[PDB]
């Protein structure tokens, strides 16, 4: 019944709330399904300092529900706190999906060929070359050329 605690006006309880979510989210992934509609309030509020992290728990609960593109949507406006974590499983899934989206968008962009271009968010394209620097740092040479084949750019 921790969902009803989101009715409190002070955001200082909201930071503690998300701190409970991400810890018990493995078993309580289903417990956030009906609260999604209350998460919309925290994400859509600009005066809410934790919206950046609100999109993380939203993207996780959509990972449980089997939502892919819908988790990408919060992935974008989730801020720096989202792409700062390279640990464990959730980081590779989202960049595989985001680069799939990105590379089909880029095969489309090269077919314009120029003019009336689609808007390309700086976050979705910045994690591309940003995480490509991992292939330059680890010196792994087979993946380094693969990404450049994917974006077609």
């Amino acid at each position: 019944g921790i969902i009803s605690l989101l009715d409190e006006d002070e955001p200082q309880l909201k930071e503690f709330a998300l701190h409970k979510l991400n810890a018990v989210v493995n078993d309580f992934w289903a417990e956030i399904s009906e609260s999604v509609d209350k998460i919309e309030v925290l994400y859509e509020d600009e005066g809410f300092r934790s919206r950046q992290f609100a999109a993380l728990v939203a993207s996780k609960v959509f990972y449980h529900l089997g939502a892919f593109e819908e988790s990408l949507n919060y992935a974008l406006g989730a801020g720096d706190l989202f792409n700062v974590n390279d640990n464990s499983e959730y980081v590779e899934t989202i960049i595989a999906k985001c680069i799939d989206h990105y590379t089909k968008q880029c095969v489309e962009n090269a077919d314009l060929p120029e003019g009336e271009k689609k808007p390309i968010d700086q976050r979705l394209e910045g994690i591309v070359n940003k995480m490509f620097q991992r292939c330059l740092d680890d010196h792994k040479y087979k993946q380094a050329i693969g990404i450049a084949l994917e974006t077609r750019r």
Binding site: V24, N26, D27, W29, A30, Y63, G66
Partner: protein, 480 residues
């Protein structure tokens, strides 16, 4: 002493024959099956592995004790060793111990001796290819070992066996991942082992954190690699979640998926049993009656033993709440009859229109319902008993007096005589028109619409089912 002394030698070599060549031909066959084909899976020795686990689980398990073949626990867990060309000499060492046990007495080392034994696959360094063969060679003594139920100091060795299995599980997640095929043979084992997790945890403490681990595994199967595993993980979830309040009801709707394909055969139908009780808590019978009936018709051939009978115990519950119930002694089993005697008297008094007859059964036989936790129906079934009585009296009498009907059904007062009928009309129970002056109740018989609507609705199920039989016959016919 001479008689028993000469009857001790014969038994031990019987397993030392079969059990020696059993997982050597099955495990050693699946060793070459795991290198290639590997289609699907199949790995038909995985099905043979179900048969072998169930083979020892009747006779002879592992041990005991018995002071004879208890040395097989360290034997098969030793000597990988190490690479395949080096394993020939070790396969011969397994046979050298047969002459050691034939010449001198056999050595027994178990309990505290199992701690270095279970760590000897990690000491050999290493198998090194097959994690499922090491998981099977380590589990095969451990799985029937739970049958000891000594509960003292060897259950923490079962916890150490879950820890060693978790080491093999880190090796299961990190290694392969591209055409794994070890996971698909290991998902049967992750299934059985996780069920043994809950088995051991039932004798000590329910697992709150192991469900965090289980759900990590659960959600992490999708989408990367799930074959047959997650269908079992969802049933692990549902099994103790049905016994432990709450919310787990609507938890299934967000999990599905379905999850297809249904596996393994009957293993999916039992899932329909668990969710059948669940969906019964929402009082919807039409969805509950089909999921209950499918469970029984989808499960062959038994034995064993009593759980196939219990699923039928709860099968007819939803049909009893429906108001239309077949007589249940057609499914009567000599082992089942003795168990549902009180229950059978329950349904016996339920189909009757006497309300006092029904209230007596709860008083005398409620003590058995406490153990089944079946009181959830006993509050809501009364509605169905009164509806049954009024249905009978409706069709069986043209015109009935509301004051005189209360004495037969022990309705006790004139006022509720109007209430039962009011909701009867509201739910479409009876088409009769009632006049309140005295008052009286008259009823009329209307028909001829009848076979217009009802048979075509059935035909929609009949024909669709017949063409489905045609499709399922064509599917298995085109394989040659």
């Amino acid at each position: 002493p001479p008689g028993g002394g000469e009857q001790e030698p014969p038994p031990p070599p019987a397993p030392q024959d079969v059990e020696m060549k059993e997982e050597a031909a099955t495990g050693g066959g699946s060793t070459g099956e795991a290198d290639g084909k590997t289609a699907a899976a199949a790995a038909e020795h995985s099905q043979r592995e179900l048969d072998t686990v169930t083979l020892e689980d009747i006779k002879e398990h592992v041990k005991q004790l018995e002071k004879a073949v208890s040395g097989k626990e360290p034997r098969f867990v030793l000597r990988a060793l190490r690479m395949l060309p080096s394993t020939s000499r070790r396969l011969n060492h397994y046979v050298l111990y047969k002459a050691v046990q034939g010449f001198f007495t056999s050595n027994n080392a178990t309990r505290d001796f199992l701690l270095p034994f279970l760590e000897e696959p990690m000491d050999t360094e290493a198998d090194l290819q097959f994690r499922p063969r090491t998981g099977k060679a380590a589990s095969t003594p451990l799985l029937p070992e739970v049958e000891a139920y000594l509960q003292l100091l060897v259950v923490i060795f079962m916890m150490n066996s879950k820890r060693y299995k978790e080491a093999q599980k880190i090796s299961d997640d990190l290694m392969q991942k591209i055409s794994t095929q070890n996971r698909r043979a290991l998902d049967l084992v992750a299934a059985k082992c996780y069920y043994y997790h809950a088995r051991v945890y039932e004798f000590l403490d329910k697992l709150d954190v192991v469900r965090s681990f289980l759900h990590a595994r659960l959600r992490t199967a999708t989408l990367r690699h799930d074959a047959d595993g997650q269908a079992t993980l969802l049933n692990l979830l549902l099994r103790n979640y049905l016994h432990y309040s709450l919310y787990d009801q609507a938890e299934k709707l967000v999990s599905k998926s379905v999850f297809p394909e249904q596996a393994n055969n009957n293993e999916w139908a039992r899932y329909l049993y668990y969710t059948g009780r669940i969906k019964a808590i929402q009082l919807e019978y039409s969805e509950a009656r089909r999921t209950m009936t499918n469970a029984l018709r989808k499960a062959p051939q038994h034995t064993a033993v009593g759980f196939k009978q219990t699923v039928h115990k709860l099968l007819i519950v939803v049909e009893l709440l429906l108001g239309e119930i077949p007589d249940r002694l057609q499914f009567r089993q000599p082992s089942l009859k003795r168990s549902l005697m009180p229950y059978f008297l329950l349904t016996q008094a339920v189909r009757t229109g006497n309300l006092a007859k029904f209230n007596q059964v709860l008083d005398q036989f409620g003590e058995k319902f406490q153990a089944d936790g079946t009181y959830t129906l006993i509050i809501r079934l009364r509605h169905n008993v009164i509806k049954t009585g009024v249905r009978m009296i409706s069709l069986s009498y043209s015109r009935i007096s509301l004051a005189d009907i209360a004495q037969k059904l022990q309705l006790d007062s004139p006022e509720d005589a109007e209430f039962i009928v009011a909701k009867a009309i509201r739910d479409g129970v009876i088409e009769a028109s009632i006049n309140h002056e005295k008052g009286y109740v008259q009823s009329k018989e209307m028909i001829d619409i009848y076979s217009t609507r009802e048979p075509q609705l059935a035909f929609h199920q009949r024909i669709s089912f017949c063409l489905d039989i045609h499709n399922m016959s064509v599917k298995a016919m085109r394989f040659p």
